[PDB]
């Protein structure tokens, strides 16, 4: 049992804030004083409350498997990964939102990339390589990814081109069964 170290919390908050706008709102002193303190286990990070950590630090490390909700894991090279497990945290306070239609969400949930015919409506001032969160017509959080280009270049490109690159979806839920 250990917390996030200096560089390890730096890269974690680097990749999080690439998709997050208010990191202050996620981890803040609440009414009861409990805080959303980060936590990692078996090279896999988690997002828990402090009072959750106290009632979980009583346990041997090998017996514990997960804790709270998961955010991602670290590779051998040290880069950070954010998973579809972090989607309810991610979609709660999302910066950039892209909405795809039902005939385009089905290839998105299968594992295919986002096409211009898939999206229904759009956000504004989206840069070329900025992160974004993918929604449907009914504001159901589907996934996340990095767009291929900016907003203005998406208007002037062919409708068959790839718009936003698909990183994760609910197929990991279907894979683990």
């Amino acid at each position: 049992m250990r917390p996030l170290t200096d560089q390890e919390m730096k890269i974690v908050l680097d990749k999080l804030a690439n998709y997050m706008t208010d990191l202050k709102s996620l981890i803040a002193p609440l009414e009861d004083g409990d805080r959303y303190v980060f936590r990692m286990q078996k090279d896999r990070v988690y997002y828990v409350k402090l009072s959750i950590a106290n009632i979980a630090t009583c346990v041997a490390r090998d017996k514990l498997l997960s804790l709270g909700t998961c955010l991602g894991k670290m590779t051998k090279s040290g880069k950070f990964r954010l998973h579809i497990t972090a989607l309810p945290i991610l979609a709660q306070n999302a910066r950039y939102k892209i909405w795809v239609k039902d005939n385009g969400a089905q290839p998105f949930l299968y594992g295919s990339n986002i096409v211009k015919a898939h999206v229904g409506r759009w956000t504004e001032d989206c840069p070329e390589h900025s992160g974004c969160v993918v929604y449907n017509m009914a504001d159901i959080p589907l996934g996340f990814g990095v767009t291929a280009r900016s907003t203005a270049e998406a208007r002037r490109l062919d409708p068959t081109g790839i718009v936003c690159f698909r990183q994760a979806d609910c197929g990991e839920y279907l894979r683990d069964e």
Partner: protein, 324 residues
Amino acid sequence: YTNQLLKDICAYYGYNEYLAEKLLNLFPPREAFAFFEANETPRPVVIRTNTLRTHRRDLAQALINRGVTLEPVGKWSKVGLQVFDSKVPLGATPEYLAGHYILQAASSFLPVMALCPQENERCLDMAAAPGGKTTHMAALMKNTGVIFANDPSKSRAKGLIGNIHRLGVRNTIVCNYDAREFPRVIGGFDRVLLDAPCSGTGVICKDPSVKTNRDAKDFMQLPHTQKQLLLAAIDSCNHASKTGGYIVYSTCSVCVEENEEVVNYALSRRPNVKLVETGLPFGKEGFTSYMGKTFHPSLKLTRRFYPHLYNVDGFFVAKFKKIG
């Protein structure tokens, strides 16, 4: 004769001789013949919607438009529907992929309505292998509180983490402990839920191996195994709290060696445990004494579920309250 009926049942249906002797002693032959017809008949598949995500008439409208035949399951379940036919596969539909509902049986419905989880409560589930049991308390409590879930195996541990994060509970800690090791290490839980593993005689349509692969060593070890589970269950529960917590014991067995005998041992050993009415509409009365063994006569409130009167799986539920 009794021996002639036992030989005719074992030859025609394929049950073990010792298991058929137990079932013939448990029930009258007219009830046993309906039992042998019911458990060989496949059980219906029911759908439990996510109250944190949508409501019942919204999902019912969506699945009707997608082509799924639906029917609500009585008046005792406002959260459940029953599936008759579906042109679109249930696993590939957008609602299940988003996490609007989950698939379960009627046995997975009951012990969570037996519990009454409230907001900002501490709950335990020492055996939640399908993962639908832990989700429903989060659906009832509206994602407020702390939940602990225990699992013995890694294969079903990776199975449920795909289920809970699809459903979006966000506050349940799942792990790989021993349920006997749970109260000594952490303890101090307001509510505890136990789905004790057993022979599985209640559900043989899902598990056909129970018909033959149950020897005399099995009906001695598993009742002793769940005996230590309920001893761990009563040690985890708190006697006093701001919101009244309870112990809920559930199993998928129909024999009396797994039902109303273990809960009699826990009641006799610990006087601090009291059993109350579980608030359940349909069920069967507990037996005061079955095989030369005098149980406590307060077990009339303990409920049972049988496959022939209702379209449910074989099940058994008990509720307890701690005093000291």
